[PDB]
Ligand binder design. Structure first.
Ligand SMILES: *Cc1cc2c(cc1C)nc1c(=O)[nH]c(=O)nc-1n2C[C@H](O)[C@H](O)[C@H](O)COP(=O)(O)OP(=O)(O)OC[C@H]1O[C@@H](n2cnc3c(N)ncnc32)[C@H](O)[C@@H]1O
Length: 550
Protein backbone atom coordinates (compact mmCIF):
# COMPACT_ATOMS: atom_id res chain seq x y z
CA UNK A 1 0.00 0.00 0.00
CA UNK A 2 2.90 2.37 0.47
CA UNK A 3 4.81 0.56 -2.34
CA UNK A 4 5.48 2.47 -5.55
CA UNK A 5 7.33 1.51 -8.77
CA UNK A 6 10.20 2.81 -10.78
CA UNK A 7 8.88 3.21 -14.33
CA UNK A 8 10.71 3.83 -17.57
CA UNK A 9 8.72 5.46 -20.34
CA UNK A 10 9.83 5.29 -23.95
CA UNK A 11 8.70 8.37 -25.90
CA UNK A 12 7.67 11.88 -24.85
CA UNK A 13 4.71 12.46 -27.23
CA UNK A 14 1.15 12.69 -25.76
CA UNK A 15 1.12 8.96 -24.70
CA UNK A 16 4.45 9.37 -22.87
CA UNK A 17 3.75 12.72 -21.18
CA UNK A 18 0.25 11.81 -20.04
CA UNK A 19 1.47 8.44 -18.81
CA UNK A 20 4.28 10.13 -16.78
CA UNK A 21 2.05 12.90 -15.38
CA UNK A 22 -0.54 10.31 -14.32
CA UNK A 23 2.04 7.90 -12.79
CA UNK A 24 3.62 10.86 -10.87
CA UNK A 25 0.23 11.98 -9.48
CA UNK A 26 -0.27 8.33 -8.44
CA UNK A 27 3.01 8.61 -6.52
CA UNK A 28 5.36 6.58 -8.72
CA UNK A 29 8.86 7.32 -9.83
CA UNK A 30 8.98 8.23 -13.55
CA UNK A 31 11.69 8.55 -16.18
CA UNK A 32 10.89 9.60 -19.80
CA UNK A 33 13.33 8.86 -22.65
CA UNK A 34 12.61 10.82 -25.86
CA UNK A 35 14.94 10.33 -28.88
CA UNK A 36 14.28 13.78 -30.38
CA UNK A 37 14.91 17.30 -29.29
CA UNK A 38 11.71 19.28 -28.68
CA UNK A 39 10.08 21.06 -30.29
CA UNK A 40 9.85 18.67 -33.22
CA UNK A 41 7.32 18.74 -36.10
CA UNK A 42 4.46 16.22 -35.97
CA UNK A 43 1.25 15.71 -37.93
CA UNK A 44 -2.01 14.83 -36.07
CA UNK A 45 -3.45 18.15 -35.13
CA UNK A 46 -7.16 17.90 -34.32
CA UNK A 47 -8.08 17.00 -30.75
CA UNK A 48 -11.17 15.83 -28.84
CA UNK A 49 -13.10 16.92 -25.71
CA UNK A 50 -12.19 13.66 -23.95
CA UNK A 51 -8.50 14.57 -24.05
CA UNK A 52 -9.09 18.14 -22.74
CA UNK A 53 -11.02 16.57 -19.88
CA UNK A 54 -7.98 14.44 -19.06
CA UNK A 55 -5.54 17.29 -19.27
CA UNK A 56 -7.86 19.43 -17.08
CA UNK A 57 -7.97 16.69 -14.38
CA UNK A 58 -4.17 16.50 -14.52
CA UNK A 59 -3.95 20.26 -13.82
CA UNK A 60 -3.05 21.71 -17.15
CA UNK A 61 -6.08 24.00 -17.68
CA UNK A 62 -4.34 27.32 -17.06
CA UNK A 63 -1.28 26.49 -19.19
CA UNK A 64 -3.61 25.36 -21.98
CA UNK A 65 -5.89 28.44 -21.79
CA UNK A 66 -2.67 30.46 -22.06
CA UNK A 67 -1.88 28.91 -25.43
CA UNK A 68 -4.96 30.31 -27.23
CA UNK A 69 -5.39 27.18 -29.38
CA UNK A 70 -7.92 27.51 -32.19
CA UNK A 71 -11.26 26.22 -30.77
CA UNK A 72 -12.98 23.29 -32.49
CA UNK A 73 -16.80 23.06 -32.15
CA UNK A 74 -17.31 19.95 -34.21
CA UNK A 75 -16.23 17.90 -37.20
CA UNK A 76 -17.83 18.48 -40.59
CA UNK A 77 -18.03 15.83 -43.33
CA UNK A 78 -18.60 16.17 -47.08
CA UNK A 79 -19.25 12.52 -47.55
CA UNK A 80 -19.96 11.03 -50.93
CA UNK A 81 -20.91 12.98 -54.07
CA UNK A 82 -23.97 15.23 -54.17
CA UNK A 83 -24.77 14.69 -50.53
CA UNK A 84 -25.89 17.32 -48.11
CA UNK A 85 -23.04 18.09 -45.61
CA UNK A 86 -23.17 16.67 -42.10
CA UNK A 87 -21.67 17.88 -38.82
CA UNK A 88 -20.81 16.03 -35.58
CA UNK A 89 -21.34 18.55 -32.75
CA UNK A 90 -19.24 18.37 -29.59
CA UNK A 91 -22.26 19.84 -27.65
CA UNK A 92 -22.64 18.26 -24.18
CA UNK A 93 -23.83 19.24 -20.57
CA UNK A 94 -19.10 17.61 -14.10
CA UNK A 95 -16.39 20.46 -14.29
CA UNK A 96 -14.08 18.42 -16.62
CA UNK A 97 -16.83 17.65 -19.20
CA UNK A 98 -15.96 19.54 -22.38
CA UNK A 99 -18.20 20.84 -25.15
CA UNK A 100 -15.35 21.61 -27.55
CA UNK A 101 -11.71 20.77 -28.22
CA UNK A 102 -8.95 22.53 -30.07
CA UNK A 103 -6.62 22.33 -33.00
CA UNK A 104 -2.85 22.48 -32.32
CA UNK A 105 0.58 22.69 -33.75
CA UNK A 106 1.87 19.36 -32.39
CA UNK A 107 5.50 20.52 -31.97
CA UNK A 108 4.17 23.11 -29.49
CA UNK A 109 1.49 21.06 -27.80
CA UNK A 110 3.75 18.02 -27.29
CA UNK A 111 6.48 20.27 -25.82
CA UNK A 112 4.03 21.90 -23.42
CA UNK A 113 3.09 18.50 -21.91
CA UNK A 114 6.66 17.40 -21.66
CA UNK A 115 7.81 20.65 -19.96
CA UNK A 116 4.91 20.30 -17.59
CA UNK A 117 6.28 16.79 -16.72
CA UNK A 118 9.74 18.33 -16.05
CA UNK A 119 8.25 20.99 -13.75
CA UNK A 120 6.76 18.32 -11.57
CA UNK A 121 10.18 16.75 -11.01
CA UNK A 122 9.70 13.89 -13.49
CA UNK A 123 13.03 13.03 -15.02
CA UNK A 124 13.11 13.71 -18.74
CA UNK A 125 15.93 12.90 -21.17
CA UNK A 126 15.52 14.42 -24.62
CA UNK A 127 17.82 13.29 -27.42
CA UNK A 128 18.13 9.91 -25.66
CA UNK A 129 16.73 7.14 -27.85
CA UNK A 130 15.90 3.77 -26.25
CA UNK A 131 17.95 1.37 -28.27
CA UNK A 132 16.96 -1.95 -26.68
CA UNK A 133 14.37 -3.22 -24.21
CA UNK A 134 15.02 -6.50 -22.43
CA UNK A 135 12.21 -8.27 -20.68
CA UNK A 136 13.73 -11.74 -20.41
CA UNK A 137 14.53 -11.25 -16.76
CA UNK A 138 11.11 -11.77 -15.20
CA UNK A 139 11.95 -9.57 -12.13
CA UNK A 140 12.81 -6.39 -13.94
CA UNK A 141 12.98 -4.49 -17.17
CA UNK A 142 16.37 -3.46 -18.59
CA UNK A 143 16.64 -0.71 -21.21
CA UNK A 144 19.59 0.20 -23.34
CA UNK A 145 19.77 3.95 -24.01
CA UNK A 146 22.12 6.10 -26.18
CA UNK A 147 23.44 8.88 -23.92
CA UNK A 148 26.02 10.93 -25.80
CA UNK A 149 27.52 8.27 -28.12
CA UNK A 150 27.67 5.73 -25.30
CA UNK A 151 25.21 2.94 -24.74
CA UNK A 152 23.97 3.22 -21.16
CA UNK A 153 21.91 0.62 -19.39
CA UNK A 154 18.99 1.28 -16.99
CA UNK A 155 16.68 -1.00 -14.92
CA UNK A 156 13.10 -0.43 -13.76
CA UNK A 157 10.10 -2.25 -12.35
CA UNK A 158 7.86 -1.43 -15.35
CA UNK A 159 8.20 -0.08 -18.83
CA UNK A 160 5.66 1.79 -20.94
CA UNK A 161 6.26 1.83 -24.70
CA UNK A 162 4.81 5.15 -25.86
CA UNK A 163 7.26 5.30 -28.71
CA UNK A 164 4.63 5.77 -31.44
CA UNK A 165 4.44 3.64 -34.60
CA UNK A 166 8.20 3.12 -34.33
CA UNK A 167 8.09 2.01 -30.67
CA UNK A 168 10.53 -0.88 -30.05
CA UNK A 169 8.39 -3.34 -28.08
CA UNK A 170 5.70 -4.33 -30.59
CA UNK A 171 8.44 -4.76 -33.15
CA UNK A 172 10.70 -6.70 -30.87
CA UNK A 173 7.84 -9.09 -29.97
CA UNK A 174 6.45 -9.28 -33.51
CA UNK A 175 2.91 -8.95 -32.21
CA UNK A 176 1.80 -6.07 -34.51
CA UNK A 177 -1.16 -7.09 -36.78
CA UNK A 178 -1.46 -4.80 -39.78
CA UNK A 179 -4.95 -4.47 -41.13
CA UNK A 180 -5.45 -6.51 -44.27
CA UNK A 181 -7.15 -3.61 -46.10
CA UNK A 182 -6.94 -0.27 -44.30
CA UNK A 183 -3.54 0.75 -45.63
CA UNK A 184 -3.77 4.48 -45.83
CA UNK A 185 -0.97 6.67 -47.13
CA UNK A 186 -1.01 10.44 -46.46
CA UNK A 187 0.32 13.51 -48.28
CA UNK A 188 -0.14 16.96 -46.81
CA UNK A 189 0.89 20.57 -46.59
CA UNK A 190 -0.21 23.98 -45.21
CA UNK A 191 -2.04 26.95 -46.69
CA UNK A 192 -2.50 30.60 -45.72
CA UNK A 193 -6.26 30.94 -45.62
CA UNK A 194 -8.70 32.42 -43.14
CA UNK A 195 -11.60 30.28 -41.91
CA UNK A 196 -14.31 31.23 -44.46
CA UNK A 197 -17.06 30.67 -41.92
CA UNK A 198 -18.30 32.92 -39.12
CA UNK A 199 -21.19 30.90 -37.75
CA UNK A 200 -21.28 27.59 -35.94
CA UNK A 201 -18.94 26.20 -38.72
CA UNK A 202 -15.91 28.20 -37.53
CA UNK A 203 -12.99 26.01 -36.48
CA UNK A 204 -14.64 22.78 -37.68
CA UNK A 205 -12.52 19.91 -39.05
CA UNK A 206 -13.44 19.16 -42.72
CA UNK A 207 -13.23 15.63 -44.18
CA UNK A 208 -14.05 15.48 -47.88
CA UNK A 209 -14.32 12.50 -50.14
CA UNK A 210 -13.06 12.37 -53.77
CA UNK A 211 -12.22 9.55 -56.22
CA UNK A 212 -9.03 8.24 -54.63
CA UNK A 213 -9.86 8.84 -50.91
CA UNK A 214 -10.49 11.87 -48.66
CA UNK A 215 -9.10 15.33 -47.89
CA UNK A 216 -8.66 16.94 -44.41
CA UNK A 217 -8.77 20.66 -43.73
CA UNK A 218 -7.82 21.71 -40.15
CA UNK A 219 -7.52 25.35 -39.00
CA UNK A 220 -4.53 25.36 -36.69
CA UNK A 221 -4.38 29.18 -36.59
CA UNK A 222 -6.37 32.28 -37.53
CA UNK A 223 -5.10 32.03 -41.12
CA UNK A 224 -3.39 28.62 -41.18
CA UNK A 225 -4.88 25.39 -42.51
CA UNK A 226 -3.42 21.90 -42.47
CA UNK A 227 -4.61 20.27 -45.75
CA UNK A 228 -4.01 16.52 -46.21
CA UNK A 229 -4.82 13.76 -48.68
CA UNK A 230 -5.56 10.26 -47.44
CA UNK A 231 -5.17 7.80 -50.33
CA UNK A 232 -4.47 4.07 -50.74
CA UNK A 233 -0.96 2.72 -50.32
CA UNK A 234 -1.12 1.73 -54.03
CA UNK A 235 -0.38 5.43 -54.74
CA UNK A 236 3.11 4.98 -53.24
CA UNK A 237 4.56 4.17 -56.62
CA UNK A 238 3.20 7.37 -58.22
CA UNK A 239 4.62 9.59 -55.53
CA UNK A 240 7.95 7.70 -55.73
CA UNK A 241 8.01 8.17 -59.44
CA UNK A 242 6.53 11.66 -59.92
CA UNK A 243 7.54 13.38 -56.62
CA UNK A 244 5.30 14.33 -53.65
CA UNK A 245 4.83 17.96 -54.86
CA UNK A 246 3.39 17.05 -58.22
CA UNK A 247 1.28 14.24 -56.70
CA UNK A 248 -0.07 16.60 -54.06
CA UNK A 249 -1.26 19.42 -56.32
CA UNK A 250 -2.72 17.22 -59.11
CA UNK A 251 -4.50 15.02 -56.61
CA UNK A 252 -5.81 17.89 -54.48
CA UNK A 253 -7.17 19.51 -57.68
CA UNK A 254 -9.43 16.46 -58.15
CA UNK A 255 -11.44 17.40 -55.00
CA UNK A 256 -13.77 20.16 -56.15
CA UNK A 257 -15.39 21.10 -52.76
CA UNK A 258 -11.83 21.35 -51.32
CA UNK A 259 -10.52 23.59 -54.12
CA UNK A 260 -13.79 25.43 -53.65
CA UNK A 261 -12.87 26.35 -50.01
CA UNK A 262 -9.18 26.78 -50.74
CA UNK A 263 -9.60 29.22 -53.65
CA UNK A 264 -6.17 30.50 -54.65
CA UNK A 265 -4.87 30.47 -51.05
CA UNK A 266 -1.10 30.27 -50.84
CA UNK A 267 0.70 27.00 -50.07
CA UNK A 268 3.00 27.97 -47.22
CA UNK A 269 5.06 24.86 -46.49
CA UNK A 270 6.66 21.79 -48.08
CA UNK A 271 4.61 18.61 -48.55
CA UNK A 272 5.27 15.58 -46.41
CA UNK A 273 4.18 11.98 -46.75
CA UNK A 274 3.79 8.97 -44.57
CA UNK A 275 2.35 5.46 -44.51
CA UNK A 276 -0.44 5.42 -41.89
CA UNK A 277 -1.84 1.88 -41.98
CA UNK A 278 -4.25 0.66 -39.37
CA UNK A 279 -2.98 -2.22 -37.11
CA UNK A 280 -3.48 -3.50 -33.58
CA UNK A 281 -1.40 -5.95 -31.46
CA UNK A 282 -1.84 -9.46 -30.26
CA UNK A 283 -0.68 -8.13 -26.83
CA UNK A 284 -1.43 -4.62 -25.48
CA UNK A 285 0.41 -5.40 -22.22
CA UNK A 286 1.75 -8.37 -20.22
CA UNK A 287 4.21 -8.97 -17.37
CA UNK A 288 6.12 -5.72 -16.79
CA UNK A 289 5.24 -3.75 -19.96
CA UNK A 290 2.34 -1.75 -21.36
CA UNK A 291 2.02 -0.35 -24.91
CA UNK A 292 0.20 3.02 -25.17
CA UNK A 293 -0.95 5.09 -28.20
CA UNK A 294 0.42 4.31 -31.69
CA UNK A 295 2.90 1.91 -30.04
CA UNK A 296 -0.16 -0.32 -29.38
CA UNK A 297 -2.51 0.38 -32.27
CA UNK A 298 -3.25 2.93 -34.99
CA UNK A 299 -6.70 4.02 -36.13
CA UNK A 300 -7.57 5.66 -39.47
CA UNK A 301 -7.54 9.34 -38.54
CA UNK A 302 -10.95 10.11 -40.14
CA UNK A 303 -12.46 10.76 -36.68
CA UNK A 304 -9.30 12.26 -35.14
CA UNK A 305 -9.13 9.60 -32.42
CA UNK A 306 -5.36 9.15 -32.33
CA UNK A 307 -4.27 11.58 -29.57
CA UNK A 308 -7.36 10.71 -27.60
CA UNK A 309 -6.52 6.97 -27.58
CA UNK A 310 -2.89 7.79 -26.76
CA UNK A 311 -4.14 9.86 -23.73
CA UNK A 312 -6.74 7.43 -22.57
CA UNK A 313 -4.53 4.38 -22.79
CA UNK A 314 -1.72 6.33 -21.09
CA UNK A 315 -4.02 7.12 -18.16
CA UNK A 316 -5.16 3.48 -18.07
CA UNK A 317 -1.67 2.05 -18.21
CA UNK A 318 -0.66 4.38 -15.33
CA UNK A 319 -3.63 3.28 -13.20
CA UNK A 320 -2.92 -0.34 -14.14
CA UNK A 321 0.73 -0.13 -13.05
CA UNK A 322 -0.40 1.51 -9.77
CA UNK A 323 -2.93 -1.21 -9.05
CA UNK A 324 -0.52 -4.05 -9.71
CA UNK A 325 2.15 -2.37 -7.59
CA UNK A 326 -0.20 -2.19 -4.53
CA UNK A 327 -1.98 -5.52 -5.20
CA UNK A 328 0.39 -7.92 -6.92
CA UNK A 329 -2.07 -10.84 -6.78
CA UNK A 330 -4.31 -8.94 -9.26
CA UNK A 331 -1.59 -8.89 -11.94
CA UNK A 332 -3.37 -11.12 -14.42
CA UNK A 333 -6.76 -9.58 -13.96
CA UNK A 334 -5.35 -6.06 -14.43
CA UNK A 335 -3.53 -6.94 -17.64
CA UNK A 336 -6.64 -8.75 -18.92
CA UNK A 337 -8.59 -5.58 -18.22
CA UNK A 338 -6.04 -3.34 -20.04
CA UNK A 339 -6.02 -5.73 -23.08
CA UNK A 340 -9.81 -6.14 -23.30
CA UNK A 341 -10.46 -2.45 -22.94
CA UNK A 342 -7.97 -1.34 -25.63
CA UNK A 343 -9.00 -4.12 -27.99
CA UNK A 344 -12.66 -3.30 -27.70
CA UNK A 345 -12.00 0.44 -28.40
CA UNK A 346 -9.93 -0.46 -31.48
CA UNK A 347 -12.32 -3.06 -32.90
CA UNK A 348 -15.39 -0.92 -32.55
CA UNK A 349 -13.83 2.17 -34.07
CA UNK A 350 -12.90 -0.18 -36.99
CA UNK A 351 -16.46 -1.60 -37.37
CA UNK A 352 -17.82 1.91 -37.35
CA UNK A 353 -15.31 3.11 -39.87
CA UNK A 354 -16.35 0.29 -42.21
CA UNK A 355 -19.91 1.71 -42.19
CA UNK A 356 -18.76 5.23 -43.06
CA UNK A 357 -16.51 4.08 -45.89
CA UNK A 358 -19.35 1.90 -47.28
CA UNK A 359 -21.76 4.92 -47.35
CA UNK A 360 -19.35 7.00 -49.35
CA UNK A 361 -18.66 4.08 -51.69
CA UNK A 362 -22.23 4.32 -53.08
CA UNK A 363 -21.45 7.66 -54.66
CA UNK A 364 -17.70 7.46 -55.16
CA UNK A 365 -16.15 5.56 -58.12
CA UNK A 366 -14.94 1.99 -57.91
CA UNK A 367 -11.28 2.91 -57.24
CA UNK A 368 -8.88 0.69 -55.25
CA UNK A 369 -9.30 3.10 -52.32
CA UNK A 370 -13.06 2.59 -51.98
CA UNK A 371 -12.98 -1.07 -52.97
CA UNK A 372 -10.46 -2.02 -50.31
CA UNK A 373 -12.42 -0.23 -47.59
CA UNK A 374 -16.11 -0.74 -48.34
CA UNK A 375 -17.83 -3.69 -46.76
CA UNK A 376 -17.30 -7.02 -48.61
CA UNK A 377 -20.57 -8.96 -49.17
CA UNK A 378 -22.79 -10.63 -51.89
CA UNK A 379 -23.95 -8.68 -55.03
CA UNK A 380 -27.45 -9.02 -53.46
CA UNK A 381 -26.58 -7.86 -49.86
CA UNK A 382 -25.00 -4.81 -51.53
CA UNK A 383 -27.94 -3.83 -53.78
CA UNK A 384 -30.23 -4.34 -50.73
CA UNK A 385 -27.69 -2.02 -48.97
CA UNK A 386 -28.87 0.77 -51.34
CA UNK A 387 -31.57 0.84 -48.74
CA UNK A 388 -29.12 3.69 -48.34
CA UNK A 389 -30.52 5.57 -51.40
CA UNK A 390 -33.33 6.78 -49.11
CA UNK A 391 -32.22 8.06 -45.70
CA UNK A 392 -22.25 0.45 -35.97
CA UNK A 393 -23.75 1.00 -39.47
CA UNK A 394 -27.20 1.93 -38.33
CA UNK A 395 -25.15 3.57 -35.62
CA UNK A 396 -23.43 5.55 -38.37
CA UNK A 397 -26.56 6.01 -40.34
CA UNK A 398 -27.90 7.59 -37.20
CA UNK A 399 -25.05 10.04 -36.72
CA UNK A 400 -25.23 11.20 -40.35
CA UNK A 401 -28.99 11.80 -40.22
CA UNK A 402 -28.80 13.74 -36.95
CA UNK A 403 -25.94 15.81 -38.32
CA UNK A 404 -27.44 16.43 -41.76
CA UNK A 405 -27.45 20.12 -42.80
CA UNK A 406 -30.89 21.30 -43.92
CA UNK A 407 -29.79 22.46 -47.36
CA UNK A 408 -27.93 20.68 -50.22
CA UNK A 409 -24.66 22.62 -49.92
CA UNK A 410 -22.26 23.94 -47.32
CA UNK A 411 -22.99 27.49 -46.13
CA UNK A 412 -22.60 29.91 -43.24
CA UNK A 413 -26.38 29.67 -43.04
CA UNK A 414 -25.67 26.58 -40.91
CA UNK A 415 -26.39 26.66 -37.20
CA UNK A 416 -26.14 23.67 -34.86
CA UNK A 417 -29.69 24.37 -33.74
CA UNK A 418 -30.96 23.34 -37.21
CA UNK A 419 -29.83 19.82 -36.14
CA UNK A 420 -32.10 19.77 -33.07
CA UNK A 421 -35.17 18.39 -34.77
CA UNK A 422 -33.45 15.31 -36.19
CA UNK A 423 -31.83 14.75 -32.77
CA UNK A 424 -35.09 14.98 -30.98
CA UNK A 425 -36.78 12.84 -33.54
CA UNK A 426 -34.21 10.14 -32.83
CA UNK A 427 -34.88 10.41 -29.10
CA UNK A 428 -38.67 10.21 -29.69
CA UNK A 429 -38.08 7.12 -31.82
CA UNK A 430 -35.95 5.55 -29.07
CA UNK A 431 -38.60 6.47 -26.48
CA UNK A 432 -41.30 4.97 -28.66
CA UNK A 433 -39.38 1.69 -29.10
CA UNK A 434 -38.58 1.17 -25.43
CA UNK A 435 -42.25 1.89 -24.54
CA UNK A 436 -43.46 -0.72 -27.01
CA UNK A 437 -41.53 -3.40 -25.15
CA UNK A 438 -44.03 -5.48 -23.25
CA UNK A 439 -41.73 -8.46 -22.78
CA UNK A 440 -37.97 -8.77 -22.06
CA UNK A 441 -35.85 -11.95 -22.20
CA UNK A 442 -32.49 -12.42 -20.47
CA UNK A 443 -29.60 -14.26 -22.17
CA UNK A 444 -28.84 -17.32 -20.04
CA UNK A 445 -30.80 -18.32 -16.91
CA UNK A 446 -28.65 -16.52 -14.40
CA UNK A 447 -28.02 -12.86 -13.61
CA UNK A 448 -24.71 -12.39 -11.81
CA UNK A 449 -22.27 -9.80 -10.53
CA UNK A 450 -18.79 -9.96 -12.07
CA UNK A 451 -15.56 -8.12 -11.18
CA UNK A 452 -14.43 -5.22 -13.31
CA UNK A 453 -12.05 -2.26 -13.17
CA UNK A 454 -12.71 1.39 -13.70
CA UNK A 455 -10.39 4.39 -13.60
CA UNK A 456 -11.73 6.92 -11.05
CA UNK A 457 -11.77 10.24 -12.97
CA UNK A 458 -10.63 12.66 -10.27
CA UNK A 459 -7.67 10.87 -8.70
CA UNK A 460 -6.98 8.30 -11.46
CA UNK A 461 -6.84 5.18 -9.25
CA UNK A 462 -7.96 1.91 -10.70
CA UNK A 463 -10.93 0.84 -8.63
CA UNK A 464 -12.77 -2.46 -8.47
CA UNK A 465 -16.47 -2.49 -9.46
CA UNK A 466 -19.04 -5.26 -9.81
CA UNK A 467 -20.94 -5.23 -13.08
CA UNK A 468 -23.96 -7.11 -14.43
CA UNK A 469 -23.26 -10.32 -16.34
CA UNK A 470 -24.82 -13.67 -17.20
CA UNK A 471 -23.34 -17.06 -16.19
CA UNK A 472 -21.55 -17.19 -19.51
CA UNK A 473 -19.51 -14.10 -18.82
CA UNK A 474 -21.38 -11.66 -21.18
CA UNK A 475 -21.51 -8.33 -19.46
CA UNK A 476 -22.34 -4.66 -19.48
CA UNK A 477 -19.37 -3.02 -17.82
CA UNK A 478 -20.43 0.66 -18.13
CA UNK A 479 -22.45 0.67 -14.85
CA UNK A 480 -21.76 -0.51 -11.27
CA UNK A 481 -24.42 -2.75 -9.81
CA UNK A 482 -25.04 -4.53 -6.46
CA UNK A 483 -26.72 -7.76 -5.24
CA UNK A 484 -29.84 -5.70 -5.11
CA UNK A 485 -29.96 -4.58 -8.69
CA UNK A 486 -28.87 -8.06 -9.76
CA UNK A 487 -32.09 -9.39 -8.24
CA UNK A 488 -34.04 -7.21 -10.58
CA UNK A 489 -32.49 -9.04 -13.53
CA UNK A 490 -32.86 -12.53 -12.12
CA UNK A 491 -36.59 -11.78 -11.69
CA UNK A 492 -36.59 -10.51 -15.25
CA UNK A 493 -34.91 -13.69 -16.57
CA UNK A 494 -37.63 -15.74 -14.90
CA UNK A 495 -40.80 -13.66 -15.37
CA UNK A 496 -39.89 -11.74 -18.52
CA UNK A 497 -41.68 -8.53 -17.56
CA UNK A 498 -41.56 -5.52 -19.89
CA UNK A 499 -39.97 -2.05 -19.99
CA UNK A 500 -42.46 -0.37 -17.64
CA UNK A 501 -41.73 -2.84 -14.86
CA UNK A 502 -37.98 -2.68 -15.41
CA UNK A 503 -37.93 1.16 -15.17
CA UNK A 504 -39.94 1.03 -11.97
CA UNK A 505 -37.77 -1.59 -10.33
CA UNK A 506 -34.65 0.39 -11.24
CA UNK A 507 -36.12 3.64 -9.88
CA UNK A 508 -36.99 1.77 -6.72
CA UNK A 509 -33.33 1.10 -6.07
CA UNK A 510 -31.92 4.59 -6.63
CA UNK A 511 -31.25 4.27 -10.36
CA UNK A 512 -34.10 6.29 -11.82
CA UNK A 513 -31.86 8.74 -13.69
CA UNK A 514 -29.71 6.03 -15.36
CA UNK A 515 -32.51 3.52 -16.12
CA UNK A 516 -32.84 4.44 -19.81
CA UNK A 517 -29.07 4.15 -20.32
CA UNK A 518 -28.94 0.94 -18.30
CA UNK A 519 -31.50 -0.87 -20.43
CA UNK A 520 -30.12 0.46 -23.73
CA UNK A 521 -26.65 -0.73 -22.79
CA UNK A 522 -28.01 -4.17 -21.75
CA UNK A 523 -29.74 -4.39 -25.07
CA UNK A 524 -26.52 -3.46 -27.01
CA UNK A 525 -24.59 -5.95 -24.83
CA UNK A 526 -27.00 -8.68 -26.02
CA UNK A 527 -28.06 -9.35 -22.42
CA UNK A 528 -31.66 -8.08 -23.00
CA UNK A 529 -33.92 -8.80 -25.94
CA UNK A 530 -37.15 -6.86 -26.30
CA UNK A 531 -40.44 -7.89 -27.78
CA UNK A 532 -43.44 -5.79 -28.72
CA UNK A 533 -47.11 -6.49 -28.00
CA UNK A 534 -47.36 -8.38 -31.33
CA UNK A 535 -44.36 -10.53 -30.43
CA UNK A 536 -41.84 -9.00 -32.84
CA UNK A 537 -38.33 -8.22 -31.64
CA UNK A 538 -37.64 -4.55 -30.86
CA UNK A 539 -34.17 -3.26 -31.90
CA UNK A 540 -32.59 -0.51 -29.84
CA UNK A 541 -29.16 1.17 -30.03
CA UNK A 542 -28.43 4.53 -28.39
CA UNK A 543 -24.79 5.18 -29.30
CA UNK A 544 -23.57 7.69 -31.82
CA UNK A 545 -20.54 9.42 -30.44
CA UNK A 546 -17.21 7.93 -31.63
CA UNK A 547 -15.19 7.95 -28.35
CA UNK A 548 -13.66 11.01 -26.68
CA UNK A 549 -16.86 13.03 -27.33
CA UNK A 550 -20.03 13.55 -25.17
C1 LIG B 1 -0.51 9.82 -39.63
C2 LIG B 1 -1.59 10.73 -39.17
C3 LIG B 1 -1.98 10.61 -37.83
C4 LIG B 1 -2.93 11.51 -37.37
C5 LIG B 1 -3.47 12.45 -38.20
C6 LIG B 1 -3.10 12.52 -39.55
C7 LIG B 1 -2.17 11.63 -40.05
C8 LIG B 1 -1.74 11.69 -41.49
N1 LIG B 1 -4.46 13.28 -37.72
C9 LIG B 1 -4.82 13.20 -36.40
C10 LIG B 1 -5.74 14.11 -35.88
O1 LIG B 1 -6.29 15.01 -36.59
N2 LIG B 1 -6.07 14.01 -34.55
C11 LIG B 1 -5.48 13.06 -33.76
O2 LIG B 1 -5.79 12.96 -32.57
N3 LIG B 1 -4.55 12.18 -34.26
C12 LIG B 1 -4.23 12.23 -35.57
N4 LIG B 1 -3.26 11.43 -36.05
C13 LIG B 1 -2.69 10.28 -35.29
C14 LIG B 1 -1.92 10.78 -34.09
O3 LIG B 1 -1.04 11.74 -34.52
C15 LIG B 1 -1.21 9.72 -33.29
O4 LIG B 1 -2.15 8.79 -32.81
C16 LIG B 1 -0.49 10.35 -32.05
O5 LIG B 1 0.59 11.16 -32.42
C17 LIG B 1 0.07 9.24 -31.17
O6 LIG B 1 0.65 9.78 -30.02
P1 LIG B 1 1.81 8.92 -29.37
O7 LIG B 1 2.30 9.60 -28.10
O8 LIG B 1 1.37 7.47 -29.29
O9 LIG B 1 2.97 8.82 -30.49
P2 LIG B 1 3.81 9.97 -31.15
O10 LIG B 1 3.05 11.25 -31.26
O11 LIG B 1 4.41 9.43 -32.42
O12 LIG B 1 5.02 10.16 -30.07
C18 LIG B 1 5.99 9.14 -29.90
C19 LIG B 1 7.37 9.72 -29.51
O13 LIG B 1 8.26 8.61 -29.26
C20 LIG B 1 9.55 8.94 -29.71
N5 LIG B 1 10.28 7.70 -29.90
C21 LIG B 1 10.11 6.78 -30.89
N6 LIG B 1 10.97 5.76 -30.67
C22 LIG B 1 11.75 6.05 -29.61
C23 LIG B 1 12.78 5.36 -28.99
N7 LIG B 1 13.17 4.18 -29.44
N8 LIG B 1 13.34 5.92 -27.88
C24 LIG B 1 12.94 7.14 -27.39
N9 LIG B 1 11.92 7.79 -28.00
C25 LIG B 1 11.33 7.26 -29.10
C26 LIG B 1 9.33 9.83 -30.92
O14 LIG B 1 10.37 10.75 -31.05
C27 LIG B 1 8.00 10.54 -30.62
O15 LIG B 1 8.23 11.84 -30.17
Amino acid sequence: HMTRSKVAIIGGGPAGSVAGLTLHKLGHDVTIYERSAFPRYRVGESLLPGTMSILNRLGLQEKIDAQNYVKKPSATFLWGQDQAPWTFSFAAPAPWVFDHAVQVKREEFDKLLLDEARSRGITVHEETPVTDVDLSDPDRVVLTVRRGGESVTVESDFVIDAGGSGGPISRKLGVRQYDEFYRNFAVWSYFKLKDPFEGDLKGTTYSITFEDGWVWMIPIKDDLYSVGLVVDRSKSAEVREQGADAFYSSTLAKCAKAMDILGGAEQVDEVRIVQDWSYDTEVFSADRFFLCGDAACFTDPLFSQGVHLASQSAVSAAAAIDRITRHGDEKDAVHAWYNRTYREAYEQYHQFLASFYTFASFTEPDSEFWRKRRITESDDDRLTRKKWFESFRDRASTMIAIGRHQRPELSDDFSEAELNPARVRWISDLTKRLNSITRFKWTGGKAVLKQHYRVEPIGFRLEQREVLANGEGLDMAQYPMDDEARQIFQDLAEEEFGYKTLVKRLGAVGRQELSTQIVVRLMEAGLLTGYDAQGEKVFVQGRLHFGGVG
